[PDB]
Structure 1
Amino acid sequence: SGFRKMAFPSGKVEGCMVQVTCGTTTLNGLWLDDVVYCPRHVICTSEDMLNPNYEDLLIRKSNHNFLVQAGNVQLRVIGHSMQNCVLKLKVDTANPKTPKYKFVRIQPGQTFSVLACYNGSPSGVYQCAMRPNFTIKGSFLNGSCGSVGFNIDYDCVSFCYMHHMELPTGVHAGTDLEGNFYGPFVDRQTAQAAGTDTTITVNVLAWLYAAVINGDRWFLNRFTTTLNDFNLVAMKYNYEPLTQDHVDILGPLSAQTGIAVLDMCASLKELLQNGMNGRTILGSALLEDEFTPFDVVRQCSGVT
């Protein structure tokens, strides 16, 4: 028993982190096979970030200008290309520690682990979610760019995120491993405001199911609701609308606990309207939305 904000074991990704330096800018790169992926803003100075012309800046760079260091050994760059907002640096040596991997573009509400890195060296690992406004609430300092987000399915790492920037509001933005930003963000230091950070309803419900499984049941009530009635309350509280797809996804947790999805919705509706009254659920005084229904089943079943 017990329910924690758990990250995936990071070893497979640690074996892929490298340092990439271009001129006076140093950030992290991801070395998979004979390619090193990193943010294209490695070619920029802090001044260039105000209005960068990446194509023009990149013309002035040659393979020997991209310094890639894996541990304490230098990798030889034999090609470079820009794909969307990432650079792919072809090196002459395949990473011997390349795990089985996929590049996946995640949907908002999905969770992943981030291995925060500086100078190609891992500092820590934490679990987070892609917000509905396409930002992430991470922990990134200057130099963390190129740190990646991933999920693991047994021995296959699905990379979903590469860190690019911090918005003036303190939230984070980045790309998938094809270099396409999540949401409307651009790699330019300009006025970019995030939209409404709504709560991921299906995740809150999954976490309420984890609470029941792990003993916290005080919030269960004698009520039920409908999807339309629940959604009227969800709209009022800036919660994402719950769909029949979400209800279906919560089926296995509903079956395990014997609590119908709409009954759990009615419990959530009362928590929104009445608050917690100074009580906690799974050690939290707010409704947690960074656990997907798949995370709840995975953690509650012990998938390795």
Structure 2
Amino acid sequence: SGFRKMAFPSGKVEGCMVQVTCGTTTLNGLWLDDVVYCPRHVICTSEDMLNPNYEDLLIRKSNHNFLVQAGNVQLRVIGHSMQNCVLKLKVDTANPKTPKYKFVRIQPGQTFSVLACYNGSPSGVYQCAMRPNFTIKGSFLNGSCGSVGFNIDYDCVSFCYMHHMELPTGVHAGTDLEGNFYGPFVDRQTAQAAGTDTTITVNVLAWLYAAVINGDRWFLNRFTTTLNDFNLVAMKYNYEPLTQDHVDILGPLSAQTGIAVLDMCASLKELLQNGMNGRTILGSALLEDEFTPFDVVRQCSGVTF
């Protein structure tokens, strides 16, 4: 019983975090086998970030200009290259704590855990979602760049995010571990405005199934709807349109609870049109959209790693 914002256990990732220093800039790197991945803006000064030419700035850097420390363990840089917006630093020593891993590029609406780090040292772990406008609502201070987001499946760490930028609106932008930004964001200090922060409808439905499994049932009504009728309502409230692919993914939660997906959509329609009347669901006074269907099944079934 109970439903919490639950992060993956962070130990497999903690063992991969290092400090990367270039001149007077220090941030975090990820040490996997004999490669350290970090944001390419490690090579920039504050002035450089207004309009950086990364190819030109990197010409002035040699292997010996990159200082990499794994706790107190000095790692020797024997090669460097730029891949999109990340630097790959080849080091002399394979990380002995390298977990089984893959690099994945996640879709908007997918959730992950963030290990917030400073100077190569873990600070804390929390759950995030890739927003539909390709930002994340993180918690990141100066020095957190190169902190990573991940999922775990049994023995395997899937890295999906590396932190690069805070936007002036205080939301966060970053890359996959191939160094491609999520969304239209760039690693320069310019006018970059985020698009509409739309609600992840399939996640809200997953969380209402979690509420029913936990005994919060007041919002169940005698109504049903259709995908097209529900979607007229989703549009008005800046919800993502619901697709048959979404209905199919909610199948297992439907089967476990005996509540048809379109009946749960009718329950969500009434919540959107009438509000919550000062009531709570799983201790929230708002509709929560940072739990996936998989997240709900995992927490409600006790899956381990």
User: What is the TM-score normalised by the length of structure 2?
Assistant: 0.99
Which SS does the other structure have where 1:56 is aligned? helix
- C-alpha distance in 2 between matches for 1:74 and 1:179: 25
Shift of 1:46: 1.1
Give CA-to-partner distance per residue, 1:187-226, whole Å, 9 cap, x none. 0000000000000000000000000001100000000000
C-alpha separation in 1, matches of 2:93 and 2:5 = 36
Distance 2:42 2:206 in 1: 39
Deviations 1:241-277 (Å, cap 9, x if unpaired)? 0000000000000000000000000000000000010
What is the CA RMSD across the aligned residues, in angstroms?
A: 0.3
Structure 2 segments unaligned to the other structure (5+ residues)? none
Query: Which residue of structure 1 lines up, in the alignment, with residue 116 of structure 2?
Result: 116
Q: Does 1:55 align with 2:33?
A: no
- Alignment partner, residue 33 of structure 1: 33
- Equivalenced residue count is 304
* Counterparts of 1:110 and 1:93, CA distance in 2: 34
Once the two structures are superposed, residues 30-66 of structure 1 have per-residue CA deviations (whole angstroms, 9 ceiling, x without a partner) of: 0000000000000001111000000000000000000
Which residue of 2 is the match for residue 94 of structure 1? Answer: 94
Displacement of 1:157 in angstroms is 0.1
User: Within 2, Cα distance between the matches of 1:45 and 1:217?
Assistant: 55
Q: Could you say which residue in structure 2 is the equivalent of 1:230? A: 230
Matched ranges for 1:169-184 at <5 A: 169-184=169-184
Output the CA distance in 1 between the equivalents of 2:224 and 2:273: 15
Describe the superposition over 1:269-303 as per-residue Cα deviations: whole angstroms up to 9, x where unpaired: 00000001000000000000000000000000000
Q: TM-score, normalised by structure 1?
A: 1.00
Segments ≥4 residues shifted beyond 4 Å: none
How far apart are the structure 1 equivalents of 2:21 and 2:303?
A: 38
How many Å separate the matches in 1 of 2:2 and 2:61?
52
How many angstroms apart in 1 are the aligned matches of 2:9 and 2:148?
14
Distance in 1 between residues matched to 2:25 and 2:76, nearest whole Å: 18
Partner of 2:4: 4
CA displacement 1:221-240 (0-9 Å, x = unmatched):
00000000000000000000
Q: Give distance in 1, aligned partners of 2:78 and 2:67.
A: 11
Q: How does 1:145-224 map to 2 (within 5 A)?
A: 145-224=145-224
Q: 1: distance between equivalents of 2:73 and 2:107?
A: 37
Unaligned runs of 5+ in 1: none
In 2, the alpha carbon distance for the partners of 1:214 and 1:67 equals 50
> Shift in Å at residue 73 of structure 1?
1.6
DSSP 3-state at the match of 1:263: helix
**What CA distance in whole angstroms lies between the structure 2 residues aligned with 1:64 and 1:276?**
59
